[PDB]
Amino acid sequence: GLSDGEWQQVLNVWGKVEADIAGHGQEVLIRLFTGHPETLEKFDKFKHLKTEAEMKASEDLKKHGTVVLTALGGILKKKGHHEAELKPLAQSHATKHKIPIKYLEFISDAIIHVLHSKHPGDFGADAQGAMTKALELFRNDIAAKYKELGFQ
Ligand code: HEM
């Protein structure tokens, strides 16, 4: 649960992402894959990537980063009223992709890391607080659907 002022911070930060969605999406995925190499094994289309240089050169990885962040941005713009947008993603991630909730924690922290890396000194303590709360809400509502499905 976020206040109006917190949502305002979230959507202000998101404007930074929307200025270069593919570059942010690329770096988020590279941070996830290099920090947590077990996550790469969930992607049949990226498992061939052995080095970060290969990851950086991959146009399909940048494409997938655009898909991921476009979906997250659509959810964030709902300011918590995201049941319809979140349900299909929870279902596909539990039943088809088999993504444990832990990996959603990993990517949440990766988003925070990339924001500081690309906007050093321009991602303030209030903005980090609000973004973290928004990603926690997203993860918690997915977790509720995972529990319904019995997925671990
Ligand atoms: C911010 C969180 C994320 C968002 C919004 C997101 C969004 C999406 C979307 C929109 C798709 C395509 C449609 C679908 O299959 O449902 C997708 C595919 C996928 N997601 Fe996620 N995702 C997230 C996190 C992750 C994480 C953490 C992993 C794994 C570590 C992951 C693994 C996958 C895989 C394996 C695919 C299928 C890729 C394919 O082969 O083309 N997702 N995701």
Q: Which of 71, 76, 70 is nearest to 2 (CA)?
A: 76
Task: Give me the architecture of the 1-152 domain, per CATH.
Answer: Orthogonal Bundle (1.10)
| Pocket residue to mutate for ligand 1, from 43, 62, 93, most atoms within 8 A of Cβ | 93
Nearest CA-CA partner of 69 in 126, 16, 133, 146: 16
Resolution in A: 1.4
> Cβ neighbours of residue 17 under 8 Å, at least 6 residues apart?
24, 69, 73
Q: Please state the atom number of ligand 1 nearest to the C-alpha of residue 36.
A: 30
Ligand 1 in reach of 40 Cβ (< 6 A): no
Confirm or reject: Cβ of 86 under 6 Å from ligand 1. Answer: no
Q: Please answer whether residues 31 and 106 qualify as being in contact, where contact means their C-beta atoms are separated by less than 8 angstroms.
A: no
Q: Could you write out the DSSP letters of every residue in 32-70?
A: HHHH-GGGGGG-TTTTT--SHHHHHH-HHHHHHHHHHHH
What are the residue ranges spanned by the domains of the chain? 1-152
Is residue 92 within 8 Å of 25, Cβ to Cβ?
no
**Method by which the model was determined:** X-ray
Q: By C-alpha distance, which of 142, 3, 19 is closest to 75?
A: 142
Q: Which residue has the tokens 């200025």?
A: 19
